[PDB]
Design a protein around this ligand. Structure first.
Ligand SMILES: [Mg+2]
Ligand SMILES: [Mg+2]
Length: 132
RNA sequence: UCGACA
DNA sequence: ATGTCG
């Protein structure tokens, strides 16, 4: 019951909080469709969030109706709420990731999308295809 | 007091 | 170890 005609997204980090990146892959072929340059400090959930929103923008710009898979219950709820409820301290260190988070929320609040955001079922299907 | 997703 | 929600 994997919807193979989909985009899969994931975060990778070194530390948490720590250096965060993310990418999106074609679920069928594994081809890397986008990959964000590493952000010096962020959280896992911030990156999972940014990855979904990036995915929405990617698909919207390309007139694609493909769903997005994420394994993150947290990020899926933050996107649905249009609100990233991160605990990470907002200070000079974390300014870049908070800026990105702010700009993602703002995109969600200025655009429509129909993309279904689906939970990847890691316990049945193994690791999401975007995994680092 | 946990249970779960990362 | 930490970041998050139910
Ligand atoms: Mg993940
Ligand atoms: Mg993962």
């Amino acid at each position: 019951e994997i919807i193979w005609e989909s985009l899969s997204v994931d975060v990778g980090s070194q530390g948490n909080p720590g250096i965060v990146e993310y990418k999106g892959v074609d679920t069928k072929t594994g081809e890397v469709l986008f990959e964000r340059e590493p952000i010096p400090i962020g959280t896992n959930n911030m990156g999972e969030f940014l990855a979904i929103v990036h995915g929405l923008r990617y698909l919207k710009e390309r007139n694609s109706r493909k769903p997005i898979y994420s394994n993150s219950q947290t990020a899926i709820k933050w996107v649905k709420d249009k609100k990233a409820k991160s605990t990470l301290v907002r200070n000079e260190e974390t300014a870049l990731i908070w800026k990105l988070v702010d700009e993602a929320e703002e995109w969600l609040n200025t655009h429509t999308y129909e993309t279904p955001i689906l939970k990847w079922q890691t316990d049945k299907w193994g690791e999401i295809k975007a995994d680092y």
